[PDB]
Amino acid sequence: FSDRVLLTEESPIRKLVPFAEMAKKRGVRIHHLNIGQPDLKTPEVFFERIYENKPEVVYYSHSAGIWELREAFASYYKRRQRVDVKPENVLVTNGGSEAILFSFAVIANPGDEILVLEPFYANYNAFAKIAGVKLIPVTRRMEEGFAIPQNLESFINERTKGIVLSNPCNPTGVVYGKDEMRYLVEIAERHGLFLIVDEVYSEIVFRGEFASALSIESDKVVVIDSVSKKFSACGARVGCLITRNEELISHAMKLAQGRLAPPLLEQIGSVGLLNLDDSFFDFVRETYRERVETVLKKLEEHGLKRFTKPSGAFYITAELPVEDAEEFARWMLTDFNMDGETTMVAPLRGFYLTPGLGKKEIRIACVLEKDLLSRAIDVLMEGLKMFCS
Amino acid sequence: HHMDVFSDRVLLTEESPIRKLVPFAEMAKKRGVRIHHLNIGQPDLKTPEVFFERIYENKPEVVYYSHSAGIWELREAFASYYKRRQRVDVKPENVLVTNGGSEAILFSFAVIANPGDEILVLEPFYANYNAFAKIAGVKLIPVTRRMEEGFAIPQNLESFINERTKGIVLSNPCNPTGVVYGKDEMRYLVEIAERHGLFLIVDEVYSEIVFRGEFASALSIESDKVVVIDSVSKKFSACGARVGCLITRNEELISHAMKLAQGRLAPPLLEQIGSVGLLNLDDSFFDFVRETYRERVETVLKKLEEHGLKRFTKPSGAFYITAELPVEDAEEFARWMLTDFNMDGETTMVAPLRGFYLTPGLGKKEIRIACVLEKDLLSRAIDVLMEGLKMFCS
Fold first, then answer.
1. What proportions of chain B, in percent to the nearest 5, are helix, strand and coil?
2. B15, A254: Cβ pair inside 8 Å?
3. Residues A292 and A384 reside in one and the same domain
């Protein structure tokens, strides 16, 4: 088999599944705070639009996506992100996942390098490995508030072709403002690199004023978005690649054509999601705000010191007073259960490329109703207390 | 201001000869010309109602990411399909649901080959494989087949194997030749794979659309080096579903493919729910589909013969007809058909075959015809095409 897949060890999160399944067999209710799967009901408009526009033939749509959906994304950015985008700048893909893969393949050759801000959304490494691109980590520290490090330029070389990050960020929850993004765009332009900004969590912003990378008119910016987290439509597999660089889009379109098209029914339903009013986004933003706040308060009241207050998204990264976080996560499932309940968290080690980093850190996904989440944290800290003594 | 340095992968890629005809086609519709599209493999048949019904009946409250390998029931649906219809014993654990056959091919390539490695392909072939090969950084090596030899597997196939060769890929029934390799031919091809430690990737998307001979799935030959790709696209006219699969008995390969499926998270949920219904369709449905395409293919073959065209292939499967025209450049004729020609305000669009070959110069005078219109329209579409071909010589 290929080195690409032989060198890939399985995710620390996935490695806990066997232990979790074994716990359910013993009659234990597990609180899943390890996966970024929203629990919110998918808006009914998604299903209504599909039912009302049932096509007689489920055909391959235009490779770049149904024209109406390209318009729907364009209008969303103007109305919600206050960015002027044309439908021609939008390329509909099979979720953000594919938009990332295309971006990587269009800008870099096999063996080339793409800078990534550590810790980062682990799945980028999967798309990099498929495209044969090397992903180069640029470490950020919790103690610095996971800021963009000053030595960013030093990692650039002849093989460097781009920089990729998420904003709001998964798993740190940091939100880079207009000033920070412009700085990052300026570096991309000075060194002729493309800036891939994954904005899947835009709308889920609590502190500061969020500015899309497209707000900074540059030919090197590529924004990735999706209907997944924003509308709780993860199973739709509908996302997009947005950029003003007509040449890049035209190159990405050859890849979209080999693939033929994104899912038809999901695109039809996505048009309805993107047209949702302001009240919907207020509800989603505030639901996650209250959840994040609830966890933060619970962590603080149980004496946990080193954790980050996110400005966006629904993840909380924290440092535990343990030698190995992954061992503790497994222990929670195997050797622990408060009142027949346990809590499953994601070890953060899988979000770093640099070996040794994130050994005592974990990520908490706020994807449960606030009261259950409060209870899930109580179980987690009671378990943390016994683990030590 | 600095230039955009894009990857060689995408800079070297010229746009498809078929796609290069779209601008000329769009300009023809503006002039008031009804175009008969025989250039794309998009079926025109109604998607069976069961697909929509299953979705409506099992509407989930949350459109969640399913298990990476696909919903368990769909994995069972594919497994049962192969046992009932293909007479092959497959377990759900052997099935990995993907975003259409397209992705199953991409994963196959990434799992067996490193960037820079080689995969043999039987030319002419489904052009899109080259797209997945470029994304994975794999070099696709052509093994030319001739129409005069009935597009058979050439005897010099082993001479193309080297240290960098990691697999062989083809479609059965084949797109665009329409050849259908039987049990004997497949065994031979599997024996070569095993002797040289290569994986055999057989794209069986057109299985069911078989007219001549008895079709045998590559899985019928129990080997640890066979990987079958299938889809709900052409078989059930559900191209927009983007639901396919990778099937193999090699537990290690599927386990490695699973890591790639996990990065991607999952295939489309609603489409998987609807696909379970399509896969459970009775024998009557497949009889109707197979015979609908048989009568269409026959109609075109008769019309081509009646208009004096000599060199064309009679396919054993799929719905494509490959033919050699008496012209210097087929692609020039295809464009001409749209720009400078229209019988009774009608014209026909065909796909130049040049884009289906990697070896430069091959398929310059050849075209592909997709039988994706009702037999009477198809008959008319060929009349328009031959009247245009007759004037073109002048």
1. 45, 15, 40
2. yes
3. yes
